């Protein structure tokens, strides 16, 4: 009969324990209620198993050769025409995107390893649209175009711009209105330690750093405006990045 292989994406598929005459496995998988089925030329659980929704919305399950990527699509009645696609990586990393009646991309939510989501709505041909992203304790707004995400925080005259390029890279930057030189922030970019450092009235006040672990930290220099002093404080809520604005 049958061995349970688990699979990304909190899915089980069974595969049967030896082949058939022409050397293949048979594969069933219960999604959500909805019974697929497939046959595989490897022994491991990997392939491709297929169903139809009660409303005759085609279904796909791709399970990669190393069980460590898993795709779930949904497709108009004629097979021909996404309708939504599901994909774990092997990095766990999530991304649901679901498709226009002409089945181009028109919203994508992306959640990383650790629960932290880029939410991208709206999505219109030339790869623009609305962003939020969703992390611990806050959530940050924004837009979205084929070059970055951009979110944006304000206080006062003070804009701070959270930029996530095409590729995943970050950098921040900070914009003040403010024209009194006694008391308008400026800022410096550190991509190195992805470290944004505020200055005011030639004196560092102090630094932002946009962690790895999708968290912000706050960290004040000395009145001098030389060195650090004290430690680094994460952000847990959007009004302590207002304060940092301050």
């Known amino acids: 009969n049958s061995v349970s292989v688990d699979l990304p994406g909190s899915m089980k598929v069974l595969v049967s324990k030896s082949s058939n005459a022409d050397g293949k496995y048979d594969l069933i998988a219960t999604v959500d209620a909805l019974e697929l089925s497939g046959t595989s030329d490897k022994n491991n659980g990997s392939g491709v198993l297929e169903g139809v929704k009660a409303d005759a919305s085609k279904v796909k399950l791709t399970i990669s050769d190393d069980l460590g ?76 175009t084929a070059e970055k995400t951009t979110l944006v925080v304000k206080e006062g005259t003070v804009t701070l711009s959270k930029n996530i390029s095409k590729s995943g890279a970050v950098s921040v930057e900070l914009n003040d209105t403010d024209s009194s030189a006694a008391t308008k922030k400026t800022a410096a970019w550190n991509s190195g330690t992805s470290t944004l450092t505020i200055t005011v009235n030639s004196k560092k006040t102090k630094d932002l750093v946009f962690t790895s672990s999708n968290t912000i930290t706050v960290q004040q220099y000395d009145s001098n405006g030389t060195s650090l002093e004290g430690s680094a404080v994460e952000i847990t809520k959007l009004d302590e990045i207002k304060n940092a604005l301050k």
């Open 69 to 144: 990527q898993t795709t779930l699509e949904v497709f108009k009645s004629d097979g021909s025409t996404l309708v939504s696609k599901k994909v774990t990586s092997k990095d766990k990393v999530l991304g649901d995107v679901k498709f226009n009646e002409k089945g181009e991309v028109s919203e994508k939510i992306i959640t990383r390893a650790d629960g932290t989501r880029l939410e991208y709505t709206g999505i219109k041909s030339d790869g623009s649209g609305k962003a939020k992203e969703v992390l611990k304790g806050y959530v940050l707004e924004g837009t979205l």
